[PDB]
Amino acid sequence: TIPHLAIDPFSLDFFDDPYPDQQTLRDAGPVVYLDKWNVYGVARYAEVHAVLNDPTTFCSSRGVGLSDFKKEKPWRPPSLILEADPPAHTRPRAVLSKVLSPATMKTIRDGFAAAADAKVDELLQRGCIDAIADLAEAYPLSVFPDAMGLKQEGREHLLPYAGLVFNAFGPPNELRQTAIERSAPHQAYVNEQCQRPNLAPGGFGACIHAFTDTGEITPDEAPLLVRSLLSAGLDTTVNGIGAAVYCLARFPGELQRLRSDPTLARNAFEEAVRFESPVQTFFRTTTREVELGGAVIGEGEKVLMFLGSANRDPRRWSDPDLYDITRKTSGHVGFGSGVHMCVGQLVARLEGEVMLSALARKVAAIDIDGPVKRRFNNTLRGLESLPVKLTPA
Ligand code: HEM
Ligand SMILES: O=C(O)c1ccc(Cl)cc1
Ligand SMILES: [Cl-]
Ligand SMILES: [Mg+2]
Ligand SMILES: [Mg+2]
């Protein structure tokens, strides 16, 4: 009753061009079985959204990667937020929601916007740059570690650690084994910075520790919550901003509409998140036998959600393959949906908005002018190198 497919959604050939395989996954049925990894898969919008919003059956406390924490040891202590279910999830989630709250955004907006404007002006003096190293990576590196309150020493470990985290959600393929092997130095750096004495007062990390006073989290929980921000908060935005720049480079008509109304910057970024879906996939584990899409899934089974596919499902989206900065993006699943929906979404949108605003006001054209190279990761979709020539407005 359930179709069995041999597609490996963690293979390099899949990463290189996922869209044909994603349609095959959608059109095979509402639920598929992936023989390569012995997991169920859902790739249509309706089922992905349903699974995300059914946490009591599709749980996260057994891991949101392929590995089932009931069967194997986690490669690092479980995240207290991503890898927890309610009620354990609730108070840690509330702490991060307050640390990264609307009110908090007021305190960082001016500096984040100023750093974006300065970066774009700097790049316009060079003309010819790598939109990944020089923009998608350089900008978040210039604002986020400081907003976290990290010291200067050791920051070279941040992107390597995040790449490890996202590779580790995948299956035990070469990408994952190479990332986990000899990762101790990255783990040691991050774990050290999560301790209270190493976090600058006023930054996100120190603010997490300050919540230990309220009874929402204990002091021994705070380092792990800081770890969540250092795991999710940098590499995601790197690939989100890179996706937006890649979209604007490929769709000059949309760059021109953004230039004509810079207030579209926030939605242009949201549409880039839908269109590229920097976080491609996450898993859940069934807590009971459950019927999904006419398929009877047993207890304790991994279910792979194709977020990028759901964001391109023509059952839900008009012209899903087109980048449209005025699209009504509400309901996309690029930040998840439901109890675990990205708690850092306001930071991500702030960075993306202010960068796209700076481009909208300062740049007239973005031309790819060198070999484009893709970056392979079991969970993240994005580019390794995007050589572009920026023409000033
Ligand atoms: C474009 C950028 C980003 C994307 C595409 C993204 C994507 C996601 C997705 C899909 C989830 C849901 C996980 C699940 O359902 O299992 C999530 C959760 C989460 N994100 Fe983001 N994220 C981004 C930026 C950030 C930033 C900047 C931060 C921190 C500053 C952050 C921190 C978190 C945390 C802690 C969670 C777990 C929340 C929970 O389990 O309740 N993310 N993110
Ligand atoms: O480490 C964490 O909690 C974590 C890691 C990655 C994401 Cl996308 C969200 C949360
Ligand atoms: Cl760690
Ligand atoms: Mg260990
Ligand atoms: Mg010290």
Instruction: Give 259-299 as a DSSP string.
Output: HH-GGGHHHHHHHHHHHH-SB-EEEEEESS-EEETTEEEPT
Q: Rounded to an integer, what distance in angstroms lies between the CA atom of residue 369 and that of residue 260?
A: 24
Ligand nearest to the CA of 161: 3
Strand-strand pairing, 58-59 and 281-286: antiparallel
Cis ω on the peptide bond leading into residue 102 (within 30° of 0)? no
Which parts are annotated binding residues for heme b? 89, 93, 284, 340, 342
Give the CB-side neighbour count of residue 48, counting CA atoms within 13 A: 30
Domain residue limits, the chain = 1-393
Contact predicate 5/34, CB 8 Å: yes
Q: Which amino acid is present at 358? A: A
CA dist 37 to 174, 224, 347, Å? 14, 29, 34
Task: Report the alpha-carbon angle 238-275-361, nearest 5.
Answer: 65
Contact predicate 211/222, CB 8 Å: yes
Ligand 1, pocket-test mutation among 236, 238, 266, 284, most atoms within 8 A of CB: 236
Q: Rounded to an integer, what distance in angstroms lies between the CA atom of residue 230 and that of residue 234?
A: 7
Q: Rounded to an integer, what distance in angstroms lies between the CA atom of residue 246 and that of residue 92?
A: 35
Residue whose token pair is 């916007």: 113
* Resolution of the solved structure (Å): 1.5
Structure tokens at 126: 């060079």
Contact predicate 40/301, CB 8 Å: yes
Look at residues 37, 41, 35 and name the one whose alpha carbon lies nearest to residue 282: 41
Q: Which amino acid is present at 119? A: K
Cβ–Cβ contacts within 10 Å for residue 2, how many? 18
CA dist 188 to 100, 184, 191, 196, 234, Å? 25, 6, 5, 15, 18
Q: Rounded to an integer, what distance in angstroms lies between the CA atom of residue 290 and that of residue 72?
A: 23
Rounded distance from Cα 262 to ligand 5 centre (Å): 43
Helices (H), the chain: 12-16, 19-28, 45-52, 90-99, 102-126, 138-148, 158-168, 174-180, 184-193, 204-210, 222-232, 235-250, 252-260, 265-276, 307-310, 345-362
3-state secondary structure of 339: coil
103-107-110-114 Cα dihedral, nearest 10 degrees: -120
CA-nearest residue, atom 21 of ligand 1: 342
DSSP type of residue 61: T
Task: Report the alpha-carbon angle 315-27-312, nearest 5.
Answer: 45
Look at residues 72, 20, 34 and name the one whose alpha carbon lies nearest to residue 295: 34
Structure tokens at 351: 């960075």
CA-nearest residue, atom 12 of ligand 1: 336
Ligand nearest to the CA of 237: 1
Q: Which amino acid is present at 281? A: T
Contact predicate 273/335, CB 8 Å: yes
Contacts of 80 (CB under 8 A, 6+ apart): 88, 89, 92, 217, 221, 224, 225, 228
3-state secondary structure of 111: helix
Tell which phi-psi region holds residue 277, choosing left (phi > 0), alpha (psi between -120 and 50) or beta.
left
Q: Rounded to an integer, what distance in angstroms lies between the CA atom of residue 149 and that of residue 143?
A: 10
Q: Rounded to an integer, what distance in angstroms lies between the CA atom of residue 393 and that of residue 387?
A: 19
Rounded distance from Cα 231 to ligand 1 centre (Å): 9
Read off φ and ψ for residue 261, nearest 5 degrees.
-145, 85
Method: X-ray
| Ligand 1 lined by 65 (C-beta under 6 Å) | no
Task: Report the alpha-carbon angle 216-222-227, nearest 5.
Answer: 130
Longest dimension (CA), the chain: 60
| Ligand 2 lined by 279 (C-beta under 6 Å) | yes
Which run of H or E residues covers position 128? Answer: strand 128-130
Ligand 2: which atom is nearest the Cα of residue 282? 8
Q: Rounded to an integer, what distance in angstroms lies between the CA atom of residue 355 and that of residue 307?
A: 24
Structure tokens at 141: 């590196």
DSSP type of residue 199: S
Task: Find how far residue 269's CA is from the centre of its chain.
Answer: 13
DSSP type of residue 78: P
The residues facing 41 across adjacent strands are 32, 304
Distance separating the N- and C-terminal Cα atoms of the chain: 57
DSSP type of residue 79: P
| Ligand 1 lined by 333 (C-beta under 6 Å) | no
Q: Rounded to an integer, what distance in angstroms lies between the CA atom of residue 371 and that of residue 356?
A: 23
Contacts of 248 (CB under 8 A, 6+ apart): 254, 255, 258, 268, 356, 359, 366
| Ligand 2 lined by 129 (C-beta under 6 Å) | no
Rounded distance from Cα 18 to ligand 1 centre (Å): 22
Q: Rounded to an integer, what distance in angstroms lies between the CA atom of residue 29 and that of residue 182?
A: 40
Angle between helices 345-362 and 235-250 (to 10 degrees): 30
Contacts of 127 (CB under 8 A, 6+ apart): 389, 390
CA-nearest residue, atom 6 of ligand 2: 232
Residue whose token pair is 């023409």: 391
